[PDB]
């Protein structure tokens, strides 16, 4: 079948799979072919919404010295954009410190919070994204930031792609269109259930029926 | 991409040393123990099997363990977008950058000796800004700046010549494919210790011309290692107790391309002396051989070297023996050349020879009847008489160059040996005119010379003023 | 540095086997002394082995011709590079004669012992010229145990007495040079002839003489020796013939010449509104660094592949 011809691929990726097709599976598979293969200093990032699913990847896939981050998208920016480079791009009284009830609906407000309480700030409204925004916002700013981001990672594994919001794939598209770094999608259309956290079912779709870059595979198993 | 500066202090027999650096770097010189520390230091900062262990009381200078040791580096990421070691770099480092200093790097290290314990501990920093560095960060036994470089130490000790060669090969293609990853640089001390000759040129090309030895640090007694130099710095040891350091970024430009391999070859064994006498051909050597096997036969043992210089202009030895820190002395005669196609025009060769190493360049060209009618003797006496107009036209020029241990002859060196001993020539040239004659033959008739010389001779040739380059190269 | 200590440890021993052995019969074993020595201290340490009586019997290896230019009444013995252990040895001296120039014969000679084949020349006008020849065509004639040796202004004998005797094989590429006598004019002496000669136990030629009317002077008195050069060539056929089985190669004029008949066109080329050979032989050492500079892969094969070259493949092997 076809989980043969995408062990086989390399680039741009889509996986179109439904409910108990295996993406687990043919997401570690992928990874593992991915790291033997390629015996550069390049690694790779996995992403992914919950902790238990990190955890089963980080567990399946092993040990190693090379570093590979296997965690949620909320934890890749803030371990990799926000934390490390926010005072290259704001200035020097902007804290790297956060432990994250301190909501509110503004941006600036947000920049206030974490500036003067020194706490990650958050929004009310579920539809916008105050982490995935100050994101990109800090990409654009700092060239030691993107130069970062280039040298480390080679390609980035997504899941569950129909549950992002706006701003997620705003970050995910500037990373494969400005940066040059290849993606791996795996989502089912029909999962939008969680709706109810501003998921946005939209952007996999026009991904699925728009983008010529991508190949598109579908799994009935 | 490229390495640029280190400073070492209170280390060793190291105070204050900043020297300057390239990817391939050659040390040499006397001292033989601070050509063996600059290793040391380097494996200290970049070797995670020798920065192991700590330091010593006698690592301090001057045994005085109140003081603190710095070891600094510095590099150069301007070429992120070319090359990809810059990229193994950045990617292990992540926020000790800013972006206003995109383009240097940092690693330094720091010990402090602790007297309870008698103990030196290390500790390593990393940043952009010299003033603002932090800990490299690590767990265990492991440290974040042990996953990019790889640090390989080759020696000889701790025919057989095939076998050393057999370990460069399997070197280097060992540390290709396994080390695809990290950046790989190698400590080659005194390759040279049970190597035959060619076996030397050989392991030079391979070292000067294959791409598996990007980045280096080279200690050798051998000029034979150095014949195929090229892109290099060389670091020379000054021959005192304190430590002092000259460098010097050699490069042969493409005009000097047809004549690499003479250029080599001659300043290879100059580059392990004090000072050196720059001279034209083998005559002069001859005669001043002789010279001074009959009054200085030690000038070689304590560092003097005749150097044949031949049909080049000078610049591109000064240039790396003045950089370098040797003393050099150059004789020269006026010469006249002919050009190329007209007739009756002639080029201030040796004038214009002199001046391309005072900055000013080139003079001005000459015109000399010369009918046809004469030819032969009365040629050359014109030419002579225009020599001397010539000589005497230019006398603060002249006066200058003498400045600068620069001797230039009115003439020629027949007509300043004649003007030191011409009753000893008119006696053994009989029956002719001893500069006429010695000029027919140039090898023959000064072996004739050179064979009927006695110490009298040799020491009025040595005491004329005339002479005096030579009295430079004995320290007087 | 630490060649101090070494200097300091061989003048304890030298003053130390003496004192206490005074009643036996010492003998010095040095192997390879120059480990991580100075090339100063190499040079003082070939002038104690060689010019003081510490050292009266001694056996020494070496790997660097630094220590032998002092070389002087002893045995070399040298171990053929193969498999089988074969060795030569050679009684060395130096001649009386040969004792204002010793110091040029013994540096010239010391890295000559350490190749395989030599090829004897004379300055080094052929120096450049053949280098920059082989490094276009043969690059790595020096790995493979290749050597350029100028000679100078003496003759062939010792260096040929010395390589033949260790094995090593030698080259020579001479040309035809009229010597005016010292004093009486109008008499030269047949000198590449008489060099050649010496080298095969016939020894020295009778003089000859040429009018050269006075009124004649500058090129046409060239080729009126060159035209004698031609005609002693011609009569001596034979003998050039011999030369030639002992790896002797005479030229019949000069090197220019037999350069010409090999690069004529391109010589004309380069040297523009001149006689290629007359403007070559006015400045030898500019003009030959003007040719080089200018000459192609072509000019180098076709200097290579000539029979006036066929030296240059002796020394690399054919």
């Given at each position: 079948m076809s989980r043969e011809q995408i062990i086989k691929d390399g680039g741009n990726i889509l996986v179109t799979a439904g409910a108990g097709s295996g993406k687990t599976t043919i997401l570690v598979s992928k990874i593992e072919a991915d790291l033997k293969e390629n015996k550069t200093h390049y690694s790779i990032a996995a992403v992914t919404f919950t902790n238990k699913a990190a955890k089963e990847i980080e567990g399946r896939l092993g040990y190693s010295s090379r570093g590979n981050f296997i965690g949620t998208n909320d934890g890749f920016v803030e371990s990799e954009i926000i934390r490390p480079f926010i005072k290259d791009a704001f200035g020097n009284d902007y804290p790297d410190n956060f432990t994250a009830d301190n909501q509110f609906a503004s941006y600036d407000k947000g920049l206030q919070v974490l500036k003067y309480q020194n706490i990650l700030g958050t929004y009310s409204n579920p539809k916008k994204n105050f982490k995935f925004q100050l994101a990109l916002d800090i990409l654009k700013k700092s060239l030691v930031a993107r130069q970062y981001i280039f040298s480390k990672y080679f390609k980035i594994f997504i899941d569950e792609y129909q549950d992002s919001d706006k701003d997620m794939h705003n970050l995910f598209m500037y990373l494969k269109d400005q940066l040059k770094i290849k993606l791996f999608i795996v989502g089912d259309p029909k999962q939008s259930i969680y709706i109810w956290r501003g998921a946005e079912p939209e952007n996999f779709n026009g991904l699925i029926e728009n983008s010529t870059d991508f190949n598109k595979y579908h799994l009935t198993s | 991409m490229k390495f640029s500066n280190i400073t070492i202090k209170n280390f060793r027999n190291f105070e204050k040393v900043n020297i300057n650096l390239d990817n391939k770097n050659v040390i040499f010189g006397m001292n033989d123990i601070g050509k063996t520390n600059f290793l040391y230091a380097l494996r200290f900062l970049l070797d995670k099997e020798i920065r192991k262990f700590g330091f010593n009381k006698s690592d301090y200078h001057k045994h005085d363990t109140s003081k603190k040791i710095e070891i600094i580096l510095t590099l150069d990421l301007s070429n992120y977008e070319k090359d990809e070691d810059t990229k193994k770099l950045i990617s292990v480092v992540k926020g000790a950058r800013t972006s206003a200093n995109a383009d240097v790097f940092y690693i330094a290290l720091e010990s402090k000796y602790d007297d309870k314990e008698l103990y030196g501990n290390i500790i390593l920093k990393w940043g952009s800004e010299l003033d603002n560095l932090i800990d490299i960060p690590g767990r265990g036994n492991i440290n974040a700046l042990d996953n990019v470089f790889k640090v390989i130490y080759i020696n000889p000790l701790?025919?057989?010549?095939?076998?050393?060669?057999?370990?460069?090969?399997?070197?280097?293609?060992?540390?290709?494919?396994?080390?695809?990853?990290?950046?790989?640089?190698?400590?080659?001390?005194?390759?040279?210790?049970?190597?035959?000759?060619?076996?030397?040129?050989?392991?030079?090309?391979?070292?000067?011309?294959?791409?598996?030895?990007?980045?280096?640090?080279?200690?050798?007694?051998?000029?034979?290692?150095?014949?195929?130099?090229?892109?290099?710095?060389?670091?020379?040891?000054?021959?005192?107790?304190?430590?002092?350091?000259?460098?010097?970024?050699?490069?042969?430009?493409?005009?000097?391309?047809?004549?690499?391999?003479?250029?080599?070859?001659?300043?290879?064994?100059?580059?392990?002396?004090?000072?050196?006498?720059?001279?034209?051909?083998?005559?002069?050597?001859?005669?001043?051989?002789?010279?001074?096997?009959?009054?200085?036969?030690?000038?070689?043992?304590?560092?003097?070297?005749l150097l044949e210089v031949g049909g080049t202009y000078f610049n591109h030895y000064v240039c790396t023996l003045n950089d370098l820190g040797i003393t050099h002395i150059i004789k020269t005669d006026n010469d006249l050349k002919s050009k190329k196609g007209k007739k009756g025009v002639y080029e201030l060769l040796g004038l214009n020879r002199c001046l391309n190493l005072l900055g000013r360049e080139n003079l001005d060209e000459i015109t000399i009847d010369i009918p046809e009618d004469i030819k032969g003797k009365k040629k050359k006496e014109r030419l002579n008489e225009r020599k001397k107009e010539i000589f005497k036209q230019y006398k603060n020029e002249v006066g200058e160059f003498l400045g600068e241990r620069i001797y230039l002859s009115e003439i020629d060196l027949e007509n300043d040996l004649y003007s030191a001993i011409g009753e000893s020539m008119k006696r053994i040239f009989e029956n002719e005119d001893p500069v006429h004659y010695l000029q027919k033959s140039k090898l023959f008739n000064m072996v004739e010379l050179v064979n009927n010389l006695s110490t009298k001779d040799c020491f009025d040739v040595f005491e004329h003023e005339k002479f005096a380059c030579l009295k430079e190269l004995v320290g007087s």
């Open positions: - | 701790v025919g057989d010549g095939r076998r050393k060669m057999l370990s460069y090969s399997i070197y280097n293609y060992l540390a290709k494919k396994k080390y695809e990853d990290k950046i790989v640089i190698y400590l080659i001390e005194e390759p040279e210790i049970s190597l035959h000759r060619s076996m030397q040129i050989a392991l030079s090309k391979q070292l000067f011309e294959q791409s598996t030895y990007k980045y280096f640090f080279l200690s050798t007694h051998s000029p034979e290692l150095l014949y195929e130099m090229d892109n290099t710095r060389l670091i020379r040891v000054h021959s005192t107790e304190k430590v002092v350091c000259s460098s010097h970024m050699y490069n042969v430009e493409e005009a000097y391309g047809s004549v690499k391999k003479k250029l080599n070859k001659a300043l290879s064994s100059a580059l392990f002396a004090e000072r050196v006498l720059l001279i034209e051909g083998p005559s002069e050597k001859i005669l001043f051989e002789k010279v001074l096997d009959e009054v200085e036969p030690e000038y070689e043992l304590n560092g003097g070297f």
